[PDB]
Write a protein that binds this ligand. Structure first.
Ligand code: NA
Length: 156
């Protein structure tokens, strides 16, 4: 099954800047998110289809996550990736898709829509704590990208 969740967020950063930073997540995330150590491209050019391997630390243990870039829609300031391997995919989970879309907000900032698409095996539903964790991760990454732009104003 596929279960979809949307959350509306705001930023003081305007959407073209955020969107540009989002596309730079491979370099930004290991700097700001303590546990993310590295991002390696396995196949592809950064565009849709690209497979990436993230190396993280959890509890002093090195772990690996696999991502797939799904779609990048500049017209709607949209950047979509999926978690396709590693700890967030328990056996009844197939894939988790994290979509971010931005529009102009009032006061020269942004309104974002964070979509989480939790793909399960067969008739299973998402575990409640897994969903909570997934939403937190999605919002954390958004706030890492935003944090970077707010701390490095000249760069965007
Ligand atoms: Na780090």
């Amino acid at each position: 099954g596929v279960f979809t969740f949307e959350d509306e967020i705001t930023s003081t950063v305007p959407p073209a800047k955020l969107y540009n930073a989002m596309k730079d997540a491979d370099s930004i995330t290991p700097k700001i998110i303590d546990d993310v150590k590295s991002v390696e491209i396995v196949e592809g050019n950064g565009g849709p289809g690209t497979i990436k391997k993230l190396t993280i630390v959890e509890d002093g243990e090195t772990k690996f996550i696999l991502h797939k870039v799904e779609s990048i829609d500049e017209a709607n300031y949209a950047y979509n990736y999926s978690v396709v391997g590693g700890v967030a995919l328990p056996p009844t989970a197939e894939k988790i898709t994290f979509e971010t879309k931005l529009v102009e907000g009032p006061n020269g900032g942004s309104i974002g829509k964070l979509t989480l698409k939790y793909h399960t095996k067969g008739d299973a539903k998402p575990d409640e704590e897994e969903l909570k964790k997934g939403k937190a991760k999605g919002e954390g990454l958004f706030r890492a990208i935003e944090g970077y732009v707010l701390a490095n104003p000249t760069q965007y």
